Symmetry: D2
Subunit: 268 residues, 4 copies
C-alpha cells in the first residue's frame, strides 16, 4: 500500500518526459494513485509520452484558454472515473510565457498581449481549473500547483516571475474556495529543473549576457542549498507534490512548500 493508494488524481502539464508533471505522475502511480491526464494540441504525441509511465491513464483534452473545455471538464472526468466517483487530487503544472517575456528579451519590450497570455495560462488557469473540478473533488482532497519562488527578481525569468507572483496570490484565494469543500490548495516552489522549455531559453541565451547571468543564477542554487540541488533530478520535487496530495499535511492550505534544497533560506 503506497502513499496515494487508490486516490484518483488529475495531472496536467505533461509535455515531455522531462516535464515535472511526468515525474509527479510517475511517483504518484508508484504510490498507488489512479491518474487522469490532460493535454492540448498534441494528443497523439502526448499519449506516446504517457505510455512510458508505469501504468495506463486516460488522457483528456484541456486547453485552459478554452471556456468550453473548462465547462465540460468535470463531466468528462466523471466519464472516465465512473458515476458516483470523485477526484482526490488535482495537479496544476502548466506554466507558459511567450518568448518576449523571458530570456534575453528586455523586460520592457514584452507587449502586454504576450504577458496576458502567459498570466492566463500560468496563473488564472489555477483558479479556473479549481472552479471546474472542486464540484467533483472529495473532502480531504488536495490541489497542488507548481511555483518558482518570485519573491525576489532575477535575470531572464522576467515576466514569468510576475506570473508566478500572481499565481501565489491566486492560490491563497483558491484555498478560501476549496476550504468550503474540505479541500486544500497549495503550491510547491521548486528549484530550477531542466525541462525542454527551460533548456530552450537557457540555450538561446548562450554567449549573451543573460546566459552568463543564468549560469550564475543556476550555480547559486546548488551552492546555497545546504543539501545541494540537482537540476537534472526532478524526483525530489515529485515526491514533495505527492506529500501534499496525501493526507500527511492535513492542516496546510493556501500555502507554499519549498522543494529547492533549502536554497531560499540561505544568502550564500
Amino acid at each position: 500500500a503506497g502513499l496515494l493508494e487508490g486516490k484518483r488524481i488529475l495531472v496536467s502539464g505533461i509535455i515531455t518526459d522531462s516535464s515535472i508533471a511526468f515525474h509527479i505522475a510517475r511517483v504518484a502511480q508508484e504510490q498507488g494513485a489512479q491518474l487522469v491526464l490532460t493535454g492540448f494540441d498534441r494528443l497523439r504525441l502526448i499519449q506516446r509520452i504517457t505510455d512510458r509511465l508505469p501504468e495506463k491513464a486516460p488522457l483528456l483534452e484541456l486547453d485552459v484558454q478554452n471556456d468550453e473545455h473548462l465547462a465540460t471538464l468535470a463531466d468528462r472526468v466523471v466519464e472516465v472515473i465512473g458515476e458516483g466517483n470523485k477526484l482526490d487530487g488535482l495537479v496544476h503544472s502548466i506554466g507558459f510565457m511567450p518568448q518576449s517575456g523571458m530570456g534575453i528579451n528586455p523586460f520592457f519590450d514584452a507587449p502586454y498581449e504576450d504577458v496576458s497570455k502567459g498570466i492566463h495560462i500560468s496563473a488564472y488557469s489555477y483558479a479556473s481549473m479549481a472552479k471546474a473540478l472542486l464540484p467533483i473533488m472529495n473532502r480531504g482532497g488536495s490541489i497542488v500547483g507548481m511555483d518558482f519562488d518570485p519573491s525576489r527578481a532575477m535575470p531572464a525569468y522576467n515576466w514569468m516571475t510576475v506570473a508566478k507572483s500572481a499565481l501565489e496570490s491566486v492560490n491563497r484565494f483558491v484555498a478560501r474556495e476549496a476550504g468550503k469543500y474540505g479541500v486544500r490548495s497549495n503550491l510547491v516552489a521548486a528549484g530550477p529543473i531542466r525541462t525542454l522549455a527551460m533548456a530552450a531559453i537557457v540555450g538561446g541565451a548562450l554567449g549573451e549576457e543573460a546566459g552568463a547571468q543564468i549560469q550564475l543564477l543556476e550555480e547559486g542554487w546548488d551552492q546555497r542549498a545546504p543539501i545541494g540541488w540537482n537540476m537534472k533530478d526532478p524526483t525530489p520535487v515529485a515526491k514533495t507534490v505527492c506529500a501534499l496530495l496525501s493526507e500527511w499535511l492535513p492542516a496546510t492550505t493556501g500555502d507554499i512548500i519549498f522543494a529547492d534544497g533549502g536554497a531560499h533560506t540561505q544568502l550564500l
Copy 2:
C-alpha cells in the same frame, strides 16, 4: 525650502479629490515640487478637480492601455517642462479592476477578460510608464507606485489583490531597469483609504455577507495598528510617498514601504 523644492514630478491617478494621488500632489506642491498631471477620458472634469490643488500644473492625456499615448508621453512631458529639463519623480497611482473582480462577486466568476484589463491598468502599466519616462528622468530620481498589501488573501478585494501581487513583482524588475539610470523604484503599501471607487464597492456590499466581512476587515486595521488608522485621512500616505520622492531614502529600491499604521506587523 520644502522637501521636494524645485523637483519636477509627474503624478497620475487623480480621479476625484478623494484620490490618494490628489493628496500626494497637494503635499508635493506644499513641499515645493513642480507637477505634471495625467488623466484620461474626463480631461475637462479632471482639470476642475486639479484646479483645487494649491498650484497650477499641466494636465496631459494618458490612457495606459493606448500604445500611442505611451509612445509620445516623454515628448509631451518635455513640451511642458522645457527643452533640456527632466523629471525627478514619477507617481503611479492608477489601479482598476472591473466590477466582476471585486466586492460581492464570487472570485471564480470573474472572466479573464476582466482580470486581464485590471492587471494591464494596475500592474503592467507600472512597467510601461517607467519604460516611457526613464529616458527623461534625472539621476537620483524616484518612481513610486501605490500598493495594498496582498501577501495574505482577504474578502472582497479578490482579483485586485492578485493585481497588486503582480505589481509588487513588476516593481522589483522596474528597479533593475531604473538602476541603470540612477533611479529608484518603490511601492507604498497603504492602509485602506475611502476613495469614491472603494466606497462604491463597500456601498454595493451593504447588507451582504461581503459587506459584513469588509466592515470587520476595515475595523481590524485601526485595531491592529499600534498608532491607529484613519481611512478618511490620506495625508499620512501622501507624506510617505513624498518621503520616497525625496533623497532621504537614497539606498531603498525595488522595495515596499508600509504606510498602514503598522497594522501589517501585528496579528491583533
Copy 3:
C-alpha cells in the same frame, strides 16, 4: 508498513498527554517508528505518561541547560539503540518562557534573566541538541522543531514570540550544519494548541484585558483558516511532523512548514 517504518526517532518535549510531543510520538509509533524519549526533573512521572503511548520506548534524562547531559547524550542514545545504529529523526518540542515573559505581565517588565532562560531552552537548545546528535544521525535523516509563527506581534505571547523568532533563525543555521551529514532541519509552525502550559496562561488571564485579547486571538485562527482550526486536536500537527520526518519532503531544509489550517495566509 507505515510512513516511518523502522525509523529510529528521538522525541523530546513530552510533559503531559496534552503535549504536542505526546501526539507526535503516538503517530510516529502508529507509523512504525522506534522511539527514544527524553525528559527532565519528573522522570518517574513522565514514564507514567509515556506508558500510555501505543509502544514502549526508552526514556533518557536531558536537561538542555546542563552541559554534561548534552555531552553524554549521543553515547546514552547509542546505549539504548545499539552499537552501530544511528537515529533517523530528532524532534525538538521544548519551549519554555518564565511567567514574567508571557500572559498578563507587561512586555517591558520581564527581566532579562527570565528572557534569557526562555531563549536558552526554546531556541539555543535546538542548536545544542543538533550539535550533540548529528554525529549519530543517518544520511537522509530529519530534525524537526516546533514553532509558533512570530512574524507578527500579538497579545500575551510576548517574549515567547521573541524566542520563536530566534528559533527560526537558529533553524536556518542548523540546516547549514545538518546538510554536511545529509540531514534536513525544519520547523512546523502550528496553530494554537491547548496544552496544559498554554491553558495555565490563558486561565490566568481570565477577566483581564489580556484574556479578552487572547480569546479574540484564538477565535481568529479558526475563522481565518480556510479549513478551520481545532485547538483541542493536535493530530494534524503531529501528522505534519511525521511528514517531515519521512522522506516525502526530501528537498526541504532550513524551512518552516505551517500546520495552522492556512490561517497565516488569510487576513480575515
Copy 4:
C-alpha cells in the same frame, strides 16, 4: 531649516568615527537636531571622537546591561535637556556578539553564556531603552534601531544573525508599547558597513574559508543592488535613519526599512 530642526534626539552606539551612529549623529546635526549621546567604559575616549561632530552634544554613561544606569537614564537625560522638555527621537545602534558567536568560529561552538550576552546587548536592550525613555518622549516621536537582514542565514554572521532576528521581533512589541505614547518604532536594515568591529572579524578571517565566503557575501551586495552598494559610505544609511526620525513616514511603525541598495529584493 533642516529635516530635524529643533528635534531632541538621543543617539547611542558611537564607538569610532566609522560607527554608523557617528554618521547618523552627523547628518542629524546637519539637519538641525539637538543630540544627547550615550557611551560606556571609554567616556573620555568617546568624547574625543564626538568632538569631531559638527556640533557639541552632552555625553551620558549607559551600560545597557546595568539596571541602575537604565533606572536613572530618563532623569539624567532631563538634566541635560531641561525641565519640561522631552526627546523627539531615540537611535539604538548598539550591537555586539562575543567572538565565539561570529566569524570563523563554528556556529555550534558558541557557548550560550556568550550568545546570551550578545542577545542582551543587541536585542533586549532595544526594549529596555524604550522602557526607560518612552515616559520622556514626545507624541509624534520616533525610535529607530539598526538591523542587518537576518531572514536568510549566511556565513560568518552566525549568532549575530540570531540576535537580529530577535531584535526584529522585539521591535514589533516595542511598537505596541510606543503607540500608547504616539511614538513610532522601526528598524533600518542596512547593507554591510565597514566599521572597525566588522573589519576586525573580516580581517581575522583572511586566508580562511570563512573569509572567502565573507568576500563573496560582501561582493554580492553591490552586484545584487540595482543602485549599487558602497560598504565604505555610511551616509545613505544615516539619511534613512533621519527619514524615520522625521515626520515624513508618520504611518510606519513596528516595521523594517531597508537601506541596502535594494540588494534584498534581487536574487542576482
